Structure formats: structure tokens, C-alpha cells
Amino acid sequence: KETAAAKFERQHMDSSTSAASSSNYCNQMMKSRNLTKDRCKPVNTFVHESLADVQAVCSQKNVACKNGQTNCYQSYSTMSITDCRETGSSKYPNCAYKTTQANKHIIVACEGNPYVPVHFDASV
Template sequence: SGSSPSSNSNYCNLMMFCRKMTQGKCKPVNTFVHESLADCSQKKVTCKNGQTNCYQSKSTMRITDCRETGSSKYPNCAYKTTQVEKRIIVACAGKPYVPV
């Protein structure tokens, strides 16, 4: 099916296109989370950019990592699909305080 990457090496190519991440240029990296997103009351951690509004999930989550391949060239964006289970970090903002 279109929402499950389990055996589909084209998952990233399809999802990046459907989510309009290949318009104008190829987005180099994107992560799709296949479970309810961690809420903003989890363990607080420092974000990669130094901000302090990031939170780490308490448990591992099923995610799909999409990375542009070396042969990818706009408008023919191409992605490598990798499925992983790991804790994720989300940034939170706004009122109510929600993942962004």
C-alpha cells in the first residue's frame, strides 16, 4: 500500500513527490514517522541547531529515512529508502505547544 514502506524501495520517491518535496528542487533529506508523533512533554533535549525546544521520544518509533541519491538530479529526484526503529527528536512550538 502507499502508506507502508515495508517492502517498497520506491516509497520515498512516491511520498516525496506526493508531499510536494520535489517541486522546484529536490529536498535532500526527509523522515516519515509511522506512529503517533511524540508529544511535547517528553524528555527535553537540545536541538541540532542549538535551540532548546526539542523533545526525545520515550520509546523507539518506526520511521522511514529518505535521502537523495548521488544520481538524483532535478526534476528527476531519486531517493534511497531506509526503514529504521529508533527514538526520535521533535521540535515543538506555538500555543498549544505542538510538534513542528
């Protein structure tokens, strides 16, 4: 089955662009990454950084996750991200999203050996 680490890459990483380039970014990416196959995922964030820089967050500032777990880490630097949020016209299978650009610190949960991101917790 797909590993948690691979699922994080598929759901959250987009090293191929520096920022969202149009209002359609989320619509296209949510579909292409298979995030709308079974239902419209309501929210998602994409990170426009190298994979190595995001993996490195697991060695940065340890913080509590939103749900209280203690395997979360906050990046020391801000990163280029895109927030995708379902719009009012979204209706499966025609899932529709608003694209918002941001530059924020990321918080991820890490697991494993090698110890890598498996969950995107928040941006701050």
C-alpha cells in the same frame, strides 16, 4: 499560508503505513507530499505512527536541538521511521531517493499553543 504544524505533518507524518513497503517508497512520497516541487530536498524522514503519539513527544524528554535551541524533545519510545536520502542519479525534476527503514527515538522541536511539533531534528 500553511502553518508550521501543518507543514510538519505534510513533510514527516505517514500514519497510513506501518513501514516502507518497497524501494520506491521515498520516490513516491517525496513527490506526493510536494517536497520536490522547487528543488530536490536532500534528506527527509517519515514517521509511521499516529499523529497523537508524535504530538505527545512535546511533553517528553526536553533536550537541546542540534543547533543548540532548547525547545527540542526526545521520544521516550522508539518509533517506526523511514529515512529518505538523495541518490547519485537524482537530478531535478527527477528527484531520486534511497529508502531505509529504521526504529529509532525521534527528536522534534515544538512551538505554539497547542504546543506541537514544528521541526524534525534527528533520530537517535
